[PDB]
Amino acid sequence: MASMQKRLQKELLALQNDPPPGMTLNEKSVQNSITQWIVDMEGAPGTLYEGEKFQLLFKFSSRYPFDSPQVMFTGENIPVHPHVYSNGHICLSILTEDWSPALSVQSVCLSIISMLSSCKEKRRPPDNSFYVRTCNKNPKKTKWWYHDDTC
Template sequence: MDASQRRLTKELAMLVTEPPTGVCVDMQSASSDLRCWHVYVEGAKGTLYEGEKFTLQFRFDDQYPFSSPEVMFTGNVPVHPHIYSNGHICLSILTDDWTPALSVQTVCLSILSMLSSCKEKIRPVDNNFYVNTCNASSKKTKWYFHDDTV
């Protein structure tokens, strides 16, 4: 077992035994392929997404944790100013601000926080253009982060 697999095994165990509130990992997906997990998240109480359930797909390469996981929503994609209708998430810790000190848990918490702080359910202003021109892999996208105005 290489270092990446050891780290993923440790993180999976942590996510199963100490999941953040509203987060649950699909053990069947993770145990059949340690490099691709499905994680379920539920919108927090008192937010626009209260009671809504979403699925995040995490894909890890051989360089993890030195490279970020590829994370995207599948199925029911939340309507949010930083989430494209194809499931891609514009979140700096998934690209430029990634560090090996981060984990699947911290990514899930960041996404839940992003959902919880949303004031209006709208798609990104460039959603149609992005979805029609982007790479299938969100990790191969050059993101341009701008001030949060929503």
Template sequence: MTSPSASSRKALSKIASNRLQKELMEWQVNPPAGFKHKVTDNLQRWVIEVNGAPGTLYVGETYQLQVDFPEHYPMEAPQVIFVPPAPHHPHIYSNGHICLDILYDSWSPAMTVSSICISILSMLSSSTAKQRPADNDRYVKNCKNGRSPKETRWWFHDDKV
């Protein structure tokens, strides 16, 4: 889908590699409900299956997240996108980019892939309408040529969804 940013094309640091191996082992023992890691031989890119939670607009629907880890994870946030087709949601663009503060400005090295997944599921579950962001077409047009969502200056102004 989207090509990773220049920083995430570099090999993982020893710290990042150790942290991801630890997170992967924890995931295998205690995966977050509604998520399934699709096993590959690439520690730097995870593909995660997301199932819509019961009682929400997305119940019975399945989506895929692509998580690309930068060289200096967890000091730097991973790039997380939905592999199209992305869910219709006021904070998810049709190209899979997600407007969620913890993926950018509010990232903390204490966060994990599991905590990201839980936040995304919470965001999906709280939605009251299946619709694209108002600026979807303009944003997607501006993201041609593999632009990373981490290159976007996000404006986090809606905490209702």
């Protein structure tokens, strides 16, 4: 058994001892008085991000690891990518529908690395009737949307 903070201490030490090649974990003390981590990500060899560094922001909840961290690109370099928005938003299933307590900060970073390495497109069953019939298991339509306009 482990608490939210205990889980993060475990994860922290795992990544301080041996983070993935090209990755560095730096816990950031913040004015928000919550746990937020900064990750140094150098792009992998052979990709279009190779040699460039991008930063990640991991915002942890008290529910964590039973509620995924908000994970976004930050720093002064947001990568141009179909699943990366200019405001830092990262579109990965690992942060939503595929999140599980058995996962890790490391595996999220690795998911992001493989995202940048090979962009995957979305698909659905060829049986469109079937697809429509399974849409009752999908999230409901969002009305209010977050905007990037200056306030």
